[PDB]
Amino acid sequence: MINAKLLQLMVEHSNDGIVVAEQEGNESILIYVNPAFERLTGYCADDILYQDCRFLQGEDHDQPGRAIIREAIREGRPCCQVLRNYRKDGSLFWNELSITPVHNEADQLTYYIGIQRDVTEHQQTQARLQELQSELVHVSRLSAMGEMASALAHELNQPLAAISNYMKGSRRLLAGSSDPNTPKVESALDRAAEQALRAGQIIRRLRDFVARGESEKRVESLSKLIEEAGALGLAGAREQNVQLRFSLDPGADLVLADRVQIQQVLVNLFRNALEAMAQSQRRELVVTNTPAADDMIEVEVSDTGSGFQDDVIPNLFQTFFTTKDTGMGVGLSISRSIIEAHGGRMWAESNASGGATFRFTL
Amino acid sequence: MINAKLLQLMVEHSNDGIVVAEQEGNESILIYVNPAFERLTGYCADDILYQDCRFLQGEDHDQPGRAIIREAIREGRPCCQVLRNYRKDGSLFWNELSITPVHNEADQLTYYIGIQRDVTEHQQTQARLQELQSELVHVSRLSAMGEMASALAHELNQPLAAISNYMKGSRRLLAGSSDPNTPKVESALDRAAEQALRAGQIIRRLRDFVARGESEKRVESLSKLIEEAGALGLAGAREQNVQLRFSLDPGADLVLADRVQIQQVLVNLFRNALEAMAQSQRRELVVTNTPAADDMIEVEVSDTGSGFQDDVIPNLFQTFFTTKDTGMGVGLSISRSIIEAHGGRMWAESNASGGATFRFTL
Numbered sequence: 001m002i003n004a005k006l007l008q009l010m011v012e013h014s015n016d017g018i019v020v021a022e023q024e025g026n027e028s029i030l031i032y033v034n035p036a037f038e039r040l041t042g043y044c045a046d047d048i049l050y051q052d053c054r055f056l057q058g059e060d061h062d063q064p065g066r067a068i069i070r071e072a073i074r075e076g077r078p079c080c081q082v083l084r085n086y087r088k089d090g091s092l093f094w095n096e097l098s099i100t101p102v103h104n105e106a107d108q109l110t111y112y113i114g115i116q117r118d119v120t121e122h123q124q125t126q127a128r129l130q131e132l133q134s135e136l137v138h139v140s141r142l143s144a145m146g147e148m149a150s151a152l153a154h155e156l157n158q159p160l161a162a163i164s165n166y167m168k169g170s171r172r173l174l175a176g177s178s179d180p181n182t183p184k185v186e187s188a189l190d191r192a193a194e195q196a197l198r199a200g201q202i203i204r205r206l207r208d209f210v211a212r213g214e215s216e217k218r219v220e221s222l223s224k225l226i227e228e229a230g231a232l233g234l235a236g237a238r239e240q241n242v243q244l245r246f247s248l249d250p251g252a253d254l255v256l257a258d259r260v261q262i263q264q265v266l267v268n269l270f271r272n273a274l275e276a277m278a279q280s281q282r283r284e285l286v287v288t289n290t291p292a293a294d295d296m297i298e299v300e301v302s303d304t305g306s307g308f309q310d311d312v313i314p315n316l317f318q319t320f321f322t323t324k325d326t327g328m329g330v331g332l333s334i335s336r337s338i339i340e341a342h343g344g345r346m347w348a349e350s351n352a353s354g355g356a357t358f359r360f361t362l
Numbered sequence: 363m364i365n366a367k368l369l370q371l372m373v374e375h376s377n378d379g380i381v382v383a384e385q386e387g388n389e390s391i392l393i394y395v396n397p398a399f400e401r402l403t404g405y406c407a408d409d410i411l412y413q414d415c416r417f418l419q420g421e422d423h424d425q426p427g428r429a430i431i432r433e434a435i436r437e438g439r440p441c442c443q444v445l446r447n448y449r450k451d452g453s454l455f456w457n458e459l460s461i462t463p464v465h466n467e468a469d470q471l472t473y474y475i476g477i478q479r480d481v482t483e484h485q486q487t488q489a490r491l492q493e494l495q496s497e498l499v500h501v502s503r504l505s506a507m508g509e510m511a512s513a514l515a516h517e518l519n520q521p522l523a524a525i526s527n528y529m530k531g532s533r534r535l536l537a538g539s540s541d542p543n544t545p546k547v548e549s550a551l552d553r554a555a556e557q558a559l560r561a562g563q564i565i566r567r568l569r570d571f572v573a574r575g576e577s578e579k580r581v582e583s584l585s586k587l588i589e590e591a592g593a594l595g596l597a598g599a600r601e602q603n604v605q606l607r608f609s610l611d612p613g614a615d616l617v618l619a620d621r622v623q624i625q626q627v628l629v630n631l632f633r634n635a636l637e638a639m640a641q642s643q644r645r646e647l648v649v650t651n652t653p654a655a656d657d658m659i660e661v662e663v664s665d666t667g668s669g670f671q672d673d674v675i676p677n678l679f680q681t682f683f684t685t686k687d688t689g690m691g692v693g694l695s696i697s698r699s700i701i702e703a704h705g706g707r708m709w710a711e712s713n714a715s716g717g718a719t720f721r722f723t724l
C-alpha cells in the first residue's frame with residue numbers, strides 16, 4: 001500500500017482539520033488531532049485531548065446539527081453537518097464536520113474519523129446574498145406599485161376631469177331654465193358630482209400611499225454594487241456562456257446613489273440583456289465607466305443581443321411598452337426615473353454588433 | 363504521534379475521499395487512494411493508481427480551476443477549488459478538492475494530500491435557488507402591480523357605478539321636458555356617461571395587462587416545493603435559531619395549483635413568520651400536510667411569534683394594512699386572492715403559544 005508512517009506525516013501536515021476519536025458510551029473522546037485543527041480551534045492539543053468535542057459549541061447548545069450527529073453516531077452511519085463553534089478567544093466560526101464511524105476489529109472498539117473545514121466565509125457570503133435578495137424584492141415591489149399607480153392616476157385623471165367638466169357644463173346649461181324637472185335633475189347631478197370628487201381624492205390617496213417609499217442617497221462604491229448586481233442578475237451567464245468584461249476606473253468609483261436603486265437598475269439591464277441574447281452568435285456583456293462631461297461619469301452596458309427594430313427604439317423608456325411575452329415594460333421607465341432623479345441622463349442606441357448599448361450618467 | 367498504524371485504517375475507512383500523490387517535476391502521480399475515492403470516481407485502484415488525476419477531467423480542459431490549481435501547486439501554496447470530473451461510465455460530477463503540499467524531509471520529496479468531496483448536490487441546489495430567486499422577483503413585481511390595480515378597481519367600483527346611475531336617472535328625469543337646453547344637456551350627459559364607462563374599462567385594461575400570467579393547474583409534488591419555498595424564505599433559520607418541523611405525507615403530494623403562485627404564497631408566509639419571531643424566547647415553526655376533506659389536501663403552518671392582539675386579527679387580510687415599518691400589507695392580500703382564485707380555503711387563528719397558525723387547502 002503506502003508507508004504507514006508517511007501517511008501519518010501527510011495527515012499531520014494537512015491544511016484541513018483531521019481528528020480521531022473513540023466511543024465511550026455517550027462520549028466521543030478525542031485521541032488524535034492535527035495542527036490544522038489547532039490553528040482552526042485556537043486550542044492546544046494537550047488541553048483538549050481525551051475529551052468530547054461538545055465543548056466547541058460553548059453556550060450555544062440548541063443547534064439541530066447536534067441532535068442529527070447524535071442520532072447518526074448512535075446508528076453508526078457517517079454524516080456531514082455544519083455547526084456554530086467558538087474558539088478559545090471567543091470568536092465565532094462555522095465548522096463543516098464530516099464524521100465517519102469505523103469499527104477497529106484489532107481492538108473491537110468503535111472509533112470515529114472527523115474532517116473539519118472552516119466555512120465561515122461561505123456562510124457569510126450566503127447571508128450577504130440572501131440580504132441582497134430580500135432588499136431587491138422589496139424595492140422592486142415598491143417601484144412596481146409606484147409606476148402602476150402613477151400610470152393609473154394619469155390615465156384616469158383624463159376621463160374623471162372630463163366627467164366633472166360635463167357636469168359643470170350640463171349644470172350651466174340647465175341653470176338657464178325654469179322647468180319643473182330641472183331642480184330634481186339638477187340635484188341628481190350634484191350627487192353624481194359629489195361621488196365624482198371622491199374618486200379623484202381616492203386616486204391621490206392611493207397615489208400617496210405608493211409614494212411613501214424613501215428617496216435617500218448616499219456615497220456608494222461603483223465596484224461593489226457592480227459585483228452585487230452581477231451576483232444577482234447574471235444567473236444565466238454560466239449556462240449561456242456570457243463573456244463578462246468590467247472596464248473600471250479606480251479613481252472614479254464613488255457616486256451619490258442609493259445602492260439598492262442602482263442594483264435594481266443594473267439587475268433590470270442584466271435581465272434584459274440575457275433575455276434578449278437567447279439567439280446570439282456572440283454573447284459578450286461589457287460594463288465600462290468613463291468620464292463623460294461636466295464633472296459627470298458615464299456607465300455603459302453593451303450586449304450583442306437581438307436588438308431593436310427601427311420602430312421600437314424611441315419607445316423604450318415609455319411606461320408599459322414591451323416586446324417580451326412575459327415582460328411588463330416598467331423596468332426601463334423606473335430605471336430612467338431613478339437615473340434622472342440622481343441628476344443624470346439615461347439613453348439607449350443600437351450597437352454595431354446588432355445588439356444594444358445602454359448608457360447612464362452619475 | 364498516536365498509534366500510527368490505527369491511523370492508516372481510519373483513513374482507509376473514511377467516507378470522504380482521501381488521496382496521497384507525489385510530485386514528479388510538474389506532475390503529481392497518485393501513490394495512494396482510499397475506497398471512498400474508488401466509489402467517487404468509479405475506477406479501481408490498480409486502474410487509477412500511478413497516473414495524475416488530470417484525466418478525471420475528461421474533455422473539459424478549459425476550466426479556470428485548472429490554472430488556479432496549477433499555480434497553487436507550482437508556487438507551493440495549498441488550495442481548495444471545484445472541478446468538473448467524469449466517472450468511468452461518462453457521467454459528470456463536481457469535485458470539491460482541497461490540496462495540501464508537504465515536503466518530506468526524510469526523503470526530501472514533495473508529496474500532496476488531497477481531500478475530495480462530491481459537491482454536485484450543493485452546486486445544483488444553488489443553481490435552482492438562483493432560478494427560483496429570479497422568478498420570485500419577477501412574479502412579486504407582477505403580483506404587486508396586479509393587487510394595486512385590483513384594489514383601485516374595488517375602491518372605485520362604488521363611485522363610478524353611482525355616477526353612471528345618477529346620470530341615467532337624470533336622463534330619464536329630464537327626458538320629456540320642453541326647454542332650450544334640454545337636447546344639448548341630454549347629449550352632454552351621454553358623453554359624460556360615456557366617459558365614465560371608458561374610465562372603468564381603462565382600469566380593467568391595465569389590470570388585465572398585468573394579469574396575463576398563465577393560469578395553469580399542476581401535478582407538482584408538495585414535498586419538493588415545500589423544500590424550495592424553505593430554501594427561499596427560510597435562509598435565516600440557522601442564524602436566528604428557528605426550529606423547523608416538516609410533517610409531510612407521501613400520500614398527500616398532488617395538489618391543484620399554479621406552482622409560481624404557491625411558491626410566492628409560501629415565501630410570504632415564511633418571511634412573515636421569521637419577521638414576527640425576531641424577538642421570541644421560544645421559536646418553533648411547524649409545516650404539515652394532511653388528507654383533510656373535499657378530495658383536497660390541507661397544509662398548516664404554525665409559529666410561536668409575537669402574534670396579533672385581538673383588535674388586529676380581522677384586519678389581517680385587508681389590502682395595504684401593515685404593522686411593521688418595512689412591510690407593505692400586500693403579502694396576505696395576494697395570498698388570499700391566489701387561494702380563492704385556485705378554489706381553496708385560507709384562514710388564520712391565534713395559537714396557544716401566542717403566535718399564529720395559517721391554513722390553506724389545495
Ligand SMILES: Cc1cc2c(cc1C)N(C[C@H](O)[C@H](O)[C@H](O)COP(=O)(O)O)C1=NC(=O)NC(=O)[C@@H]1N2
Binds near residue numbers: 099113114
Ligand atoms: C470525530 C468527531 C469529530 C467532531 C465531533 C464528533 C466526532 C465523533 N463533533 C460533535 C460533538 O463532539 C458531539 O458529538 C455532538 O455535540 C453530539 O453529541 P451530544 O452533545 O448530542 O451528546 C464536533 N462538533 C463540533 O462542534 N465541532 C467539531 O469540530 C467536532 N468534530
Ligand SMILES: Cc1cc2c(cc1C)N(C[C@H](O)[C@H](O)[C@H](O)COP(=O)(O)O)C1=NC(=O)NC(=O)[C@@H]1N2
Binds near residue numbers: 416432445457
Ligand atoms: C493531490 C491531488 C489531488 C487531485 C488533483 C491534484 C493533486 C495534486 N487534481 C488536479 C489534477 O490532477 C491536475 O493537477 C490539474 O489539472 C492541474 O495540473 P495541469 O493540468 O495544470 O498540469 C484533481 N483534479 C481532478 O480532476 N480531480 C481530482 O480528484 C484530482 N485531485
Ligand SMILES: Nc1ncnc2c1ncn2[C@@H]1O[C@H](COP(=O)(O)OP(=O)(O)OP(=O)(O)O)[C@@H](O)[C@H]1O
Binds near residue numbers: 268
Ligand atoms: N438588451 C435589450 N435588447 C433588446 N431590447 C431590450 C433590451 N433591454 C430592453 N429592451 C426593450 O425594452 C422593453 C422593456 O424592457 P424592461 O426591462 O423595461 O421591461 P420588460 O423586460 O418588458 O419587463 P420587466 O418589467 O420584467 O423587465 C423590452 O421588451 C425590449 O423591447
Ligand SMILES: Nc1ncnc2c1ncn2[C@@H]1O[C@H](COP(=O)(O)OP(=O)(O)OP(=O)(O)O)[C@@H](O)[C@H]1O
Binds near residue numbers: 638665683686694718
Ligand atoms: N404570521 C404572522 N405573524 C405576525 N404578523 C402577521 C402574520 N400574518 C400576518 N401578520 C400581519 O399582517 C400584516 C401585513 O402582513 P403582510 O405580509 O400582508 O404585509 P406586511 O408584512 O406589512 O408587508 P409585506 O406586504 O411587504 O409582506 C402585518 O401587520 C403583520 O404583523
